[PDB]
Amino acid sequence: ARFEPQDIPLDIVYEDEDIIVINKPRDLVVHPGAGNPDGTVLNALLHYYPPIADVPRAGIVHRLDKDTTGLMVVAKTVPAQTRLVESLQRREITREYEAVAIGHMTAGGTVDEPISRHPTKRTHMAVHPMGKPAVTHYRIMEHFRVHTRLRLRLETGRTHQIRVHMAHITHPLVGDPVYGGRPRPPKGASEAFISTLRKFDRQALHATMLRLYHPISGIEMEWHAPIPQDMVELIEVMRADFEEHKDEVDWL
């Protein structure tokens, strides 16, 4: 019926009788919708494992934005999807992210502020007392001159949660076309740094680790998806920049 199977390759990190874990690339929408009638992960799943059509929403139980990269777990069976959905309702699935945010941040922390649709900018979400409760925990992994590398964990999983929470505290993600502004390279940034930053055109956000109790066996399982090349390049040039500006002697 409606949604058709499409020959769209998926990077399957792990698969067993009950679940499939994939590492989703950028430019790939998870579920069909306005402006995205097809060419989604759902379409890819129908093609890869047709029996998944007997599972609600092709076994899709959580999502990532079109241009967010990384891990997602999909149910292959009805029992598996009901349990996985329950696990999410109970906030028992660990979803960790690596991100690069604008600005020098000095401390890790928690953003606990509700989220709802921006009333005016229909492409945006917003922090609002009346929104759905949302909690994001974040740690600073590394300092750059005017950017910061973070690792975040989702307690709740609302729409654009990490992107809107980070923007809320004044540190939107690098490359975010919605919450971010124009790139701002630090004074004296190398040409390599300036252009790599300027050309980075998606939220610098990656679903890096996923841990859960297997829906059928109960065994705790954990997966990791390597930081994608675009972000590797971004982080490495920012790192080289910070080091180069450190106040230390260059021994010959």
Side-chain angles (χ1 to χ4, degrees), residues 10 25 46 59 79 111 124 135 137 146 158 160 171 200 211 217:
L10 299 169
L46 293 182
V111 177
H124 302 215
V135 179
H137 300 299
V146 300
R158 318 298 191 193
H160 295 180
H171 300 286
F200 200 83
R211 181 199 290 144
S217 73

Side-chain angles (χ1 to χ4, degrees), residues 23-77:
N23 175 355
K24 190 189 74 65
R26 61 173 299 162
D27 192 27
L28 173 61
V29 177
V30 168
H31 191 292
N36 296 299
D38 70 0
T40 73
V41 172
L42 186 144
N43 300 104
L45 291 171
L46 293 182
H47 175 275
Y48 173 66
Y49 186 53
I52 211 164
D54 286 345
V55 182
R57 214 184 309 124
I60 295 165
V61 303
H62 76 284
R63 66 181 283 296
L64 298 181
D65 293 328
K66 177 179 157 174
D67 288 333
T68 291
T69 49
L71 306 168
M72 275 173 60
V73 63
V74 174
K76 283 170 67 176
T77 70

Side-chain angles (χ1 to χ4, degrees), residues 113-144:
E113 307 284 355
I115 301 174
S116 48
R117 297 205 49 175
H118 189 304
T120 301
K121 299 198 270 179
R122 309 305 287 169
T123 59
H124 302 215
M125 291 303 292
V127 161
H128 190 289
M130 295 294 122
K132 307 182 170 70
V135 179
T136 298
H137 300 299
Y138 63 98
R139 300 183 270 152
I140 290 165
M141 300 301 290
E142 170 177 20
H143 289 289
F144 299 127

Side-chain angles (χ1 to χ4, degrees), residues 193-204:
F193 186 179
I194 293 179
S195 64
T196 301
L197 176 53
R198 197 88 163 61
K199 302 320 156 310
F200 200 83
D201 68 335
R202 71 183 187 85
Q203 315 72 90

Side-chain angles (χ1 to χ4, degrees), residues 92-216:
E92 306 179 308
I93 296 191
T94 304
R95 288 171 285 180
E96 182 174 77
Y97 288 78
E98 179 136 314
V100 178
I102 69 147
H104 185 281
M105 289 168 72
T106 56
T110 298
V111 177
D112 182 337
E113 307 284 355
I115 301 174
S116 48
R117 297 205 49 175
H118 189 304
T120 301
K121 299 198 270 179
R122 309 305 287 169
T123 59
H124 302 215
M125 291 303 292
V127 161
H128 190 289
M130 295 294 122
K132 307 182 170 70
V135 179
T136 298
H137 300 299
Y138 63 98
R139 300 183 270 152
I140 290 165
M141 300 301 290
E142 170 177 20
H143 289 289
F144 299 127
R145 288 170 60 197
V146 300
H147 300 276
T148 303
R149 179 163 66 90
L150 312 167
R151 206 101 108 188
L152 307 89
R153 289 199 185 171
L154 289 178
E155 195 168 293
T156 54
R158 318 298 191 193
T159 298
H160 295 180
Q161 193 174 309
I162 289 175
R163 291 204 260 166
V164 74
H165 270 351
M166 288 304 97
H168 179 72
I169 61 176
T170 270
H171 300 286
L173 305 190
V174 169
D176 196 316
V178 177
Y179 305 102
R182 298 255 189 75
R184 289 180 253 127
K187 183 180 324 306
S190 76
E191 292 187 5
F193 186 179
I194 293 179
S195 64
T196 301
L197 176 53
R198 197 88 163 61
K199 302 320 156 310
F200 200 83
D201 68 335
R202 71 183 187 85
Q203 315 72 90
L205 180 60
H206 175 66
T208 201
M209 179 271 273
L210 174 63
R211 181 199 290 144
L212 59 77
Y213 291 108
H214 190 282
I216 309 308

